[PDB]
Motif scaffolding. Structure first.
Motif, PDB file in Angstrom:
ATOM      1  N   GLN A  28       0.829  -1.214   0.000  1.00 29.22           N
ATOM      2  CA  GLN A  28       0.000   0.000   0.000  1.00 29.22           C
ATOM      3  C   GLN A  28       0.857   1.255   0.000  1.00 29.22           C
ATOM      4  O   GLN A  28       0.577   2.223   0.704  1.00 29.22           O
ATOM      5  N   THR A  29       1.931   1.230  -0.783  1.00 26.90           N
ATOM      6  CA  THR A  29       2.840   2.364  -0.870  1.00 26.90           C
ATOM      7  C   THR A  29       2.876   2.965  -2.263  1.00 26.90           C
ATOM      8  O   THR A  29       3.817   3.681  -2.603  1.00 26.90           O
ATOM      9  N   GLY A  30       1.868   2.694  -3.073  1.00 25.01           N
ATOM     10  CA  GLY A  30       1.805   3.317  -4.370  1.00 25.01           C
ATOM     11  C   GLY A  30       2.605   2.591  -5.413  1.00 25.01           C
ATOM     12  O   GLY A  30       3.306   3.229  -6.200  1.00 25.01           O
ATOM     13  N   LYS A  31       2.516   1.266  -5.452  1.00 20.90           N
ATOM     14  CA  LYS A  31       3.280   0.541  -6.456  1.00 20.90           C
ATOM     15  C   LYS A  31       2.528   0.456  -7.771  1.00 20.90           C
ATOM     16  O   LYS A  31       3.117   0.667  -8.834  1.00 20.90           O
ATOM     17  N   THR A  32       1.232   0.154  -7.718  1.00 22.91           N
ATOM     18  CA  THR A  32       0.478  -0.119  -8.936  1.00 22.91           C
ATOM     19  C   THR A  32       0.245   1.156  -9.734  1.00 22.91           C
ATOM     20  O   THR A  32       0.115   1.109 -10.967  1.00 22.91           O
ATOM     21  N   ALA A  33       0.251   2.301  -9.048  1.00 21.17           N
ATOM     22  CA  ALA A  33      -0.106   3.567  -9.671  1.00 21.17           C
ATOM     23  C   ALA A  33       0.900   4.005 -10.722  1.00 21.17           C
ATOM     24  O   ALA A  33       0.525   4.694 -11.672  1.00 21.17           O
ATOM     25  N   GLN A 286       2.822  14.546  -8.055  1.00 19.65           N
ATOM     26  CA  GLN A 286       1.918  14.389  -9.177  1.00 19.65           C
ATOM     27  C   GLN A 286       0.643  13.724  -8.700  1.00 19.65           C
ATOM     28  O   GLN A 286       0.690  12.767  -7.929  1.00 19.65           O
TER      29      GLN A 286
HETATM   30  N1  LIG Z   1      -0.495  10.199  -7.471  1.00 20.21           N
HETATM   31  C1  LIG Z   1      -1.411   9.743  -6.598  1.00 20.21           C
HETATM   32  N2  LIG Z   1      -2.514  10.452  -6.319  1.00 20.21           N
HETATM   33  C2  LIG Z   1      -3.431  10.008  -5.450  1.00 20.21           C
HETATM   34  N3  LIG Z   1      -3.331   8.850  -4.785  1.00 20.21           N
HETATM   35  C3  LIG Z   1      -2.273   8.045  -4.969  1.00 20.21           C
HETATM   36  C4  LIG Z   1      -1.232   8.461  -5.905  1.00 20.21           C
HETATM   37  N4  LIG Z   1      -0.306   7.501  -5.903  1.00 20.21           N
HETATM   38  C5  LIG Z   1      -0.726   6.549  -5.039  1.00 20.21           C
HETATM   39  N5  LIG Z   1      -1.899   6.868  -4.486  1.00 20.21           N
HETATM   40  C6  LIG Z   1      -2.625   6.050  -3.496  1.00 20.21           C
HETATM   41  O1  LIG Z   1      -1.932   4.835  -3.236  1.00 20.21           O
HETATM   42  C7  LIG Z   1      -2.881   3.837  -2.873  1.00 20.21           C
HETATM   43  C8  LIG Z   1      -2.441   2.466  -3.334  1.00 20.21           C
HETATM   44  O2  LIG Z   1      -2.034   2.556  -4.679  1.00 20.21           O
HETATM   45  P1  LIG Z   1      -1.271   1.285  -5.256  1.00 20.21           P
HETATM   46  O3  LIG Z   1      -2.278   0.207  -5.539  1.00 20.21           O
HETATM   47  O4  LIG Z   1      -0.292   1.723  -6.308  1.00 20.21           O
HETATM   48  O5  LIG Z   1      -0.449   0.822  -3.973  1.00 20.21           O
HETATM   49  P2  LIG Z   1       0.068  -0.683  -4.005  1.00 20.21           P
HETATM   50  O6  LIG Z   1       1.145  -0.839  -2.974  1.00 20.21           O
HETATM   51  O7  LIG Z   1       0.366  -1.014  -5.441  1.00 20.21           O
HETATM   52  O8  LIG Z   1      -1.211  -1.505  -3.512  1.00 20.21           O
HETATM   53  P3  LIG Z   1      -1.290  -3.025  -3.989  1.00 20.21           P
HETATM   54  O9  LIG Z   1       0.119  -3.498  -3.775  1.00 20.21           O
HETATM   55  O10 LIG Z   1      -2.307  -3.629  -3.064  1.00 20.21           O
HETATM   56  O11 LIG Z   1      -1.709  -2.955  -5.431  1.00 20.21           O
HETATM   57  C9  LIG Z   1      -4.157   4.217  -3.570  1.00 20.21           C
HETATM   58  O12 LIG Z   1      -5.190   4.268  -2.594  1.00 20.21           O
HETATM   59  C10 LIG Z   1      -3.941   5.612  -4.083  1.00 20.21           C
HETATM   60  O13 LIG Z   1      -4.971   6.444  -3.562  1.00 20.21           O
END
Ligand SMILES: Nc1ncnc2c1ncn2[C@@H]1O[C@H](COP(=O)(O)OP(=O)(O)OP(=O)(O)O)[C@@H](O)[C@H]1O
Lengths: 363, 52, 171
Positions: A28-33, A286
């Motif tokens: 949940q640290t913004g990897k998929t984004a 961003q």
């Molecule tokens: N640029 C951004 N603007 C707004 N929210 C963001 C941004 N980047 C990340 N987030 C937040 O990060 C959270 C998780 O995103 P993401 O799925 O990339 O994390 P993750 O670690 O990949 O989760 P998982 O591993 O379960 O897929 C989301 O709730 C999203 O709101």
């Protein structure tokens, strides 16, 4: 180039067509984004006409929830990515050899676009659950485990997966396949047995550290760790002209990171670099679903490098981004078309850009 | 005082052009307002036909 | 061709450096920035404002409404016109502006050469060690007026004098 549309990615850690880059991070640290913003950035060319500039996206969700893949399909149909997307879903309800297989079949999907001249991006997400499925299939067949109970050939698995992605030369048709595997570590670790096998295959890391996202700086690329090995030979020429200081400047700012925590009064040069480094750190933020094309990534970084931001307070920078972008969209549209066509800043382009900066910088 | 005189030398000649061209760039965009009407009706039509 | 407008606006920005404390002029340029940045995303944001009767009508097999709302769009195809209504009021504002502008422009052109003439007169007419105070009485009857009023009241003290000009006496 693979223009990801993020600011910091194409500033610091560029991606070539055929360069296997790793997005490593934590839960949940913004990897998929990052991968999702790259797929949405490829709308710049998927609407276009040239094949060799289009870039098809194959997103391969393994081990994730059903409803997450449902929302991600809904997201890729809001912003209209589904005329070029391929979703291979191996959701965690379904049993383990499906997850052992699904990224490989998606790599076959990628190789079909590779052999036929076109260019295509694939995203594995996330292979730390593929190695979970593989240690399940090798601990149900009595094969004895190795270090941390991934079985002894789990290096070979990610090997034979990620090695079906490179840049074919002109002899085979100049097609390509570029992979972004995603690795979920455990608490900022880069030295378990799995993330020291994906790193020893891919051509570099984008280490999305949890502490920077805890301060809200999203995406949270740790600059001093994220590096790419054959990125630099394939960046857009313009960014490589106006960000050859930027990696070294963020290294410079990272040098004085723990030196300024003492609170001690210092000289002038460290204060100058400290203010410019804070403006650059706040600058690379961003929002979600807004990738900026390279034609707009050049002037923002250009305003960051050459000290023009230093009179602005730190909170205005987030609206300075959209204000300076709309200032260039309304008035100096020809400069954006120059950066679009040429992809390179000549001396006259540079002087016109400096005038167009100092204009809007003056108010 | 010669300097404060000399700053305002050619200024009125330029602000009788500033005035006109600035107010033209202000008020030649109600065109784009009545363009926006045509935009948003087609957006509503696209939304309901997507629902169909 | 908007860059000439914006170039002259930044020219007036580096000229509005000369008048610090701009109330709403930069705010007027802010309002033209507002709607000019709005209109470009408005024109780039839209689709061709029409229902695609070739592809996107043949999608719905049970059509029954697409010709209806197609005719509804072609009804409102003369959408609504704008207003360049200002041909009476805007000429009045530029009339007042051009009046004040030509007054100021001719006034400072006069006052520059008047101060140049004062500088030229100042360079050749300073007989500073040999001027007669009778000539100062001749150039200023304020001199004799203040002197006579000073004797009539009796304020023989000259205030503001001792600082730059010494008392010079023995005690
Ligand atoms: N640029 C951004 N603007 C707004 N929210 C963001 C941004 N980047 C990340 N987030 C937040 O990060 C959270 C998780 O995103 P993401 O799925 O990339 O994390 P993750 O670690 O990949 O989760 P998982 O591993 O379960 O897929 C989301 O709730 C999203 O709101």
């Amino acid at each position: 180039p693979v223009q990801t549309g993020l600011k910091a990615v194409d500033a610091l850690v560029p991606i070539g067509r055929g360069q296997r880059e790793l997005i490593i991070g934590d839960r949940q640290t913004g990897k998929t984004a990052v991968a999702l913003d790259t797929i949405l950035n490829q709308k710049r060319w998927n609407n276009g006409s040239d094949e060799s500039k289009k870039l098809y996206c194959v997103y391969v969700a393994v081990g994730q929830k059903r409803s997450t893949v449902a929302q991600l399909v809904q997201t890729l149909e809001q912003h209209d990515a589904m005329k070029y997307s391929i979703i291979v879903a191996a959701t965690a309800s379904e049993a383990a050899p499906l997850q052992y297989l699904a990224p490989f079949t998606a790599a076959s999907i990628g190789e079909w676009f590779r052999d036929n001249g076109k260019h295509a991006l694939i995203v594995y997400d996330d292979l730390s659950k593929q190695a979970v499925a593989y240690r399940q299939l090798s601990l149900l067949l009595r094969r004895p485990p190795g270090r941390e109970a991934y079985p002894g050939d789990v290096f070979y698995l990610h090997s034979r997966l990620l090695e079906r992605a490179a840049k074919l030369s002109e002899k085979e048709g100049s097609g390509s396949l570029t992979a972004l595997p995603v690795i979920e570590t455990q608490g900022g670790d880069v030295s378990a047995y799995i993330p020291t096998n994906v790193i020893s295959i891919t051509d570099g890391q984008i280490f999305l550290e949890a502490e920077l996202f805890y301060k809200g700086i999203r995406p949270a690329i740790n600059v001093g760790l994220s590096v790419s090995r054959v990125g630099s030979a394939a960046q857009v020429k313009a960014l490589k002209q106006v960000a050859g200081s930027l990696k070294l400047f963020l290294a410079q700012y990272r040098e004085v990171a723990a030196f300024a925590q003492f609170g001690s009064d210092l000289d002038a040069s460290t204060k100058q670099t400290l203010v410019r480094g804070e403006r650059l750190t706040q600058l690379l933020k961003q929002n979600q679903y807004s990738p900026l094309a390279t034609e707009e990534q050049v002037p923002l970084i250009y305003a960051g490098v050459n000290g023009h931001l230093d009179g602005i307070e730190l909170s205005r920078i987030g609206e300075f981004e959209s204000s300076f972008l709309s200032y260039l969209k309304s008035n100096h549209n020809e400069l954006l078309t120059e950066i679009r066509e040429k992809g390179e800043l000549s001396k006259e382009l540079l002087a016109s850009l400096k005038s167009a900066t100092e204009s809007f910088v003056a108010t | 005082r010669i300097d404060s005189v000399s700053q305002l030398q050619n200024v009125a000649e330029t602000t009788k052009v500033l005035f006109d061209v600035s107010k033209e760039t202000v008020e030649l965009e109600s065109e784009a307002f009545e363009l926006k009407q045509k935009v948003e009706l087609a957006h509503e039509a696209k939304a309901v036909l997507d629902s169909w | 061709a908007k860059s000439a407008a914006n170039k002259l606006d930044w020219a007036k920005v580096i000229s509005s450096l000369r008048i610090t404390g701009s109330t709403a002029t930069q705010l007027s340029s802010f309002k033209k920035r507002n709607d000019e940045a709005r209109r470009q995303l408005l024109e780039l944001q839209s689709q061709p404002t029409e229902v695609d009767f070739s592809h996107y009508r043949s999608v719905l097999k049970n059509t029954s409404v697409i010709d209806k709302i197609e005719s509804y769009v072609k009804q409102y195809k003369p959408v609504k016109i704008d207003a360049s209504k200002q041909l009476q009021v805007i000429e009045s504002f530029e009339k007042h502006a051009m009046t004040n502008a030509k007054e100021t422009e001719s006034l400072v052109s006069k006052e520059l050469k008047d101060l140049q003439s004062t500088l030229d007169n100042i360079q050749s007419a300073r007989p500073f060690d040999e001027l007669t105070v009778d000539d100062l009485t001749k150039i200023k009857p304020e001199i004799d007026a203040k002197v006579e009023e000073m004797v009539k009241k009796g304020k023989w003290d000259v205030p503001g004098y001792k600082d730059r000009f010494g008392n010079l006496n023995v005690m």
